[PDB]
């Protein structure tokens, strides 16, 4: 595998599947569901890790497709099924754009996230 | 009430209690617990709302005191009890600092959040 999945027309979100998830539409999260993910985020430019839920030993929950998180995450996680692990490359358009965010993410940064979809629920 | 609670020595985190929460230490979240909050965040400078879980009609979960969220939120929520509603003023040191974050939060922004602690759990 290492299937590469193009998720936006502009090339700004491209997912590489590292471990395939479970089969079926019943194993795919729906818009508005709560998802639980583990992730590691690094800058493409330097390879430097700026955030990791794995380092914290506890995953992160959000509601899918609601704009609670960066656009790249909504788009990426919507494409995943339970237990899938992927690495997603996000152009700055799908991250923090021209401004960046705080000390660890410069403006116009391409972000690389390893994301694992642990579970989801209503 | 409208009790004002100073939470850092530098004045960078100051909470005003709008509705007092439940009594007891058993109604106070512990470091590492999951908390569920509703919030509305606005810039002090303009009054402009940059993020609201209430607009989304679904609250937000994070693990308390783990640096998953801005420092101001860890500090503020640690001081709350179940059902408390507060408004917290955060100096940029406790938000997104000199750089800001994305289009909606400029560098050196004081942030004002209304936060309600809905529940928490192990
Ligand atoms: C943590 C999940 C979350 C909830 C609500 C809003 C945004 C986020 N994080 C991300 O969207 C992307 S992950 C991330 N984005 C970051 C920006 C600066 C520093 N560290 C960061 N880590
Ligand atoms: C959403 C909760 C969350 C989870 C993980 C990491 C950060 C956050 N948000 C906050 O810390 C403060 S809330 C917030 N911070 C923001 C920065 C830019 C735009 N909107 C924002 N809303």
């Amino acid at each position: 595998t290492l299937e590469q999945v193009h998720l936006t027309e502009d090339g700004g979100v491209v997912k590489t599947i590292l471990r395939k998830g479970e089969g079926g539409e019943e194993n795919a999260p729906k818009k508005g569901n709560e998802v639980t993910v583990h992730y590691v985020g690094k800058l493409e430019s330097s390879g430097k890790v700026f955030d990791s839920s794995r380092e914290r030993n506890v995953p992160f929950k959000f509601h899918l497709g609601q704009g609670e998180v960066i656009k790249g995450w909504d788009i990426c996680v919507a494409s995943m099924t339970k237990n899938e692990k992927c690495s997603v490359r996000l152009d700055s358009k799908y991250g923090y754009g021209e401004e960046g965010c705080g000390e660890s993410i410069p403006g116009n940064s391409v972000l690389i996230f390893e994301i694992e979809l642990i579970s989801f629920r209503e």
Side-chain angles (χ1 to χ4, degrees), chain A residues 68-119:
Chain A
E68 293 182 357
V69 294
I70 55 175
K71 192 46 180 154
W73 274 24
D74 272 340
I75 295 165
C76 187
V77 177
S79 79
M80 298 177 75
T81 68
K82 185 186 186 181
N83 207 53
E84 183 176 319
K85 189 181 289 182
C86 74
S87 173
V88 65
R89 178 183 188 277
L90 307 180
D91 182 72
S92 61
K93 177 179 178 175
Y94 294 93
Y96 294 100
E98 214 159 32
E99 307 85 356
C101 187
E103 190 184 354
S104 61
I105 302 173
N108 306 299
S109 291
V110 174
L111 312 174
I112 310 297
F113 287 91
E114 181 186 275
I115 304 173
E116 179 181 2
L117 178 55
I118 297 164
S119 54

Side-chain angles (χ1 to χ4, degrees), chain A residues 23-41:
Chain A
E25 190 55 43
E26 91 268 22
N27 285 305
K30 310 303 191 286
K31 180 172 183 173
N33 289 171
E34 185 191 75
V35 294
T36 299
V37 296
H38 260 304
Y39 67 93
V40 182

